[PDB]
Write a protein that binds this ligand. Structure first.
Ligand SMILES: [Mg+2]
Ligand SMILES: [Zn+2]
Ligand SMILES: [Zn+2]
Ligand SMILES: [Zn+2]
Ligand SMILES: [Zn+2]
Ligand SMILES: [Zn+2]
Ligand SMILES: [Zn+2]
Lengths: 103, 103
DNA sequence: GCGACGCCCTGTCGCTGAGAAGCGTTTGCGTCGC
DNA sequence: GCGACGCCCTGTCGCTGAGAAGCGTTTGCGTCGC
């Protein structure tokens, strides 16, 4: 029951995907089917999340919303999506979410 | 895709289950459907395996065949099945299988 | 001390259930003679 | 050094793919006045 992690090439990031990056946590649209869960805030919403490009990454641990990457790590989702070598904070061992920081 | 770990009470261990404990690795009967995998030797066979009674155990990591528990840990499967508090070597942190010992 | 109301940077954790498995290439050792 | 054949305690590792996710109870702070 692990969601397959697919690495999206930087050249295939579209303008609509960039525009649908969340700019405020309260503006999110929840969808139990088409939404994607942010690893940090654990909300399943339809705004664009990051895509970890580490081949050894798995599941949703690499998916971060606009506000969460902005506020918890000082990184922009738009920059991460256009970064060919971007690795998620869990991959880098620097994730400060409520679960990863006690561990 | 994790096999549910069910704790079998000692009072419900039957005579047939005891008799079907493997006494020699070469006598095992392989069955891809009704067999059970031994965590140590990773063979899926129909001989009786151990049942870890630690509630926090999960999956097949607690299932050990007769010869493997006998040879790798000096414990008898019959004694382990009749032990109300028996915990698998992975739970005890003493598993010496090819995977757990490099880790 | 517990939570209101402004401020600026517009924000977060709890809980359950989660945490592989098994086919394939798989079976000890020591002392010999290839 | 690589693998045969006896011995006794009758035996084991490699590899792929595996390694949660998301609903619920969820949103910063400081300084006030309850
Ligand atoms: Mg799973
Ligand atoms: Zn988030
Ligand atoms: Zn990652
Ligand atoms: Zn984390
Ligand atoms: Zn075994
Ligand atoms: Zn166990
Ligand atoms: Zn092990």
């Amino acid at each position: 029951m692990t969601l397959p992690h697919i690495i999206r090439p930087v050249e295939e990031v579209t303008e609509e995907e960039i525009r649908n990056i969340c700019s405020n946590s309260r503006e999110k649209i929840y969808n139990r089917s088409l939404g994607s869960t942010c690893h940090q805030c654990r909300q399943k919403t339809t705004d664009t999340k990051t895509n970890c490009r580490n081949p050894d990454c798995w599941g949703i641990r690499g998916q971060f919303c606009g506000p969460c990457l902005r506020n918890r790590y000082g990184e922009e989702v738009k920059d991460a999506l256009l970064d060919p070598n971007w690795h998620c904070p869990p991959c880098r061992g620097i994730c400060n979410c409520s679960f990863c920081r006690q561990r």
